[PDB]
Design a protein around this ligand. Sequence first.
Ligand SMILES: [Zn+2]
Lengths: 231, 82
Amino acid sequence: TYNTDWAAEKTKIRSFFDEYYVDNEDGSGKAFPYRDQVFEIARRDKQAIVVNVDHIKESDIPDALELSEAITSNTKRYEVLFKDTISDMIQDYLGDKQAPVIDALDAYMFQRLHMDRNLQDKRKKYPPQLLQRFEVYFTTDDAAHETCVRNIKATEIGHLVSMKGVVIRATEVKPCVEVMTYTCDTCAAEVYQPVKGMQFTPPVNCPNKECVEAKANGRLHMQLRGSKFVK
Amino acid sequence: RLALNERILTGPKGISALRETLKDFKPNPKDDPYANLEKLMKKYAYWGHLMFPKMKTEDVLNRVETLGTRRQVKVFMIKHRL
DNA sequence: GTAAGTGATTAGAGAATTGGAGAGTGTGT
Ligand SMILES: [Zn+2]
């Protein structure tokens, strides 16, 4: 009684990005603003897309209501599918060109992918949080999702919720770990560990098969030029 | 168990790999002999580290000097000198 | 003195004894 065919859902999501439009104010044509924002990410003038679920709900597309309900009911999963479809759209726009290097992690990734050269290998070697470098956020305006702090209870876990309130306390911005990278002493291999939640446990012993078979006992040392941080 | 032995010493990580490592080494005969010795000794250490990482360079060279008495290694050297 | 044959020595292989490393499992905090 569950659906896990991700390719069909990706097809639906990409059809939304292709076919949502707004008419030009002079009547000269149509704007396709979501794919314009995707191309802004592709040329690196941007870092995030904010998607309005009510636009999906009121779009002139088959299965639009079902897609909106699925997004609202399991939002923590559909973020991954939106990131995957935007990554495929970025590669279709970009072609054989390269996106510009702007920071040390971009320089490390662009240098290391061609060191590896000198899709199965890419997706097995690198986690998707490191391969994809943009943010996706959702919004709602319909009053069905309006609630108070008092009303958010056990039925709302995992769902998208909207509310309105006053800010009492706020901290300053801190660096938060997203992906750690370790390198072995003896065999010079690398380990990538993605982090979820507010804790992580670092691995100790090298997992690479040649190092393990040789019993070289190489330690793992963490490196922050390859590791990923977020505000 | 795991130990350095005649299969490893005659295998693709062994004496042929050391020969391939030594092909680029060309000391100057008019230079300091101790300096030339230092240059040679660290190439021995590099080959030993690739060939058997568990053990110190000193113990690796002692084990190679021991294993030279085996008949299999002698037959390998008889073929290899040609 | 030289050549051929036989005896002795040396080298390799097989079998048995001794010891130490490594891994697994159990117990205590
Ligand atoms: Zn290693």
